[PDB]
């Protein structure tokens, strides 16, 4: 839901589905194709916005289908470096914290959280924050949490492709504690 990217690909229409409009068909089979798929570096596709220009169809001898090469713009979720967003924390780990978005269900913050964070999981998941300049503040974070506002940095792109003969998180983000949710910010 951040950047709309233009793409081009050939889409074959079934020979029995000729009663529906070619535009409606193409739009439906391009919505079904790129629905919940992650790509190399552009990001994660969400849906289809619209087609720009539609070329003619070709009937190759041998199959009998209809191939059309159309340019379409799909909405991909790819934020930039200095962007603040809110999330609901899934759980805690001794290495960062595991938080999720609405659809994107994998982001984890590293130990770089605050000035005095302490982590220890004896039986449950605990994140405590000590803050002493001249008075005493103790903030406690347990099994679940909501409304954490942070900046998404250290973006990583890993590709999964079959290595060797054919006989797992493609998108990775971290967060810096900015505004834990009373409200106490961090600068």
């Amino acid at each position: 839901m951040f950047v709309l990217v233009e793409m081009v690909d050939t889409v074959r229409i079934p020979p029995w589905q000729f009663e529906r409009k070619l535009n409606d068909s193409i739009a439906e089979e391009l919505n079904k194709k790129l629905a919940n798929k992650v790509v190399y570096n552009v990001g994660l596709c969400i849906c289809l916005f619209d087609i720009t220009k539609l070329e003619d169809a070709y009937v190759f001898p041998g199959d009998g289908a209809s191939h059309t090469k159309v340019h379409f713009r799909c909405v991909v979720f790819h934020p930039f470096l200095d962007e603040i967003l809110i999330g609901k924390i899934k759980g805690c780990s001794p290495e960062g914290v595991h938080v999720s978005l609405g659809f994107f269900d994998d982001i984890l913050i590293p130990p770089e959280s605050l000035q005095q964070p302490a982590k220890f999981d004896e039986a449950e998941q605990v994140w405590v924050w000590e803050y002493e300049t001249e008075e005493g503040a103790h903030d406690l974070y347990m099994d679940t949490g909501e409304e954490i506002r942070f900046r998404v940095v250290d973006e990583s792109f890993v590709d999964t492709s079959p290595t060797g003969p054919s006989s797992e998180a493609p998108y990775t983000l971290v967060g810096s504690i900015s505004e834990p949710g009373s409200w106490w910010t961090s600068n």
């Binding site: 839901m1 951040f2 950047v3 709309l4 990217v5 233009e6 793409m7 081009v8 690909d9 919505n31 079904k32 629905a35 919940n36 570096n41 552009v42 969400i46 849906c47 916005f49 340019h71 713009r73 909405v75 790819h78 930039f80 200095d82 962007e83 603040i84 809110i86 978005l101 609405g102 659809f103 900015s178 505004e179 409200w183 910010t185 600068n187």
Partner: protein
């Protein structure tokens, strides 16, 4: 597949909201729910996206108010990208203004900050 331009036509979240609201209301009337998993993936994506958008207090703003607020903020300097970065969330607090622009201490003054603050509070409802 081939890509003409990788990063192009940076859009907003309300545009996605408006596009996904009318996308599913006509899909359930027309669609036969024929392909189970292929349609299930799209349904899940759209549902999670619309839920995240509806939890975001930015759905009660039609495009004309967006255009008016953008023309109002066009006035001073702020930034092309920080324009919609500031519109993505509610800047009601003065601390979030300091985090919107990475350096908001030397460029302008805080009085002009509360000015645009009340300008935005007069724009978005609650």
């Amino acid at each position: 597949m081939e890509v003409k331009d990788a990063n192009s036509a940076l859009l907003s979240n309300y545009e996605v909201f408006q596009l996904l609201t009318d996308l599913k209301e006509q899909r359930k009337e027309s669609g036969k729910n024929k392909h189970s998993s292929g349609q299930q993936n799209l349904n899940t994506i759209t549902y999670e996206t619309l839920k995240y958008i509806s939890k975001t207090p930015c759905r009660h703003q039609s495009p004309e108010i967006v255009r008016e607020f953008l023309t109002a903020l066009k006035s001073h300097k702020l930034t092309k990208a920080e324009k919609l970065q500031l519109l993505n969330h509610r800047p009601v607090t003065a601390v979030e203004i300091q985090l919107m622009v990475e350096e908001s201490e030397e460029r302008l003054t805080e009085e002009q900050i509360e000015a645009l603050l009340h300008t935005v509070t007069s724009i978005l409802p609650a």
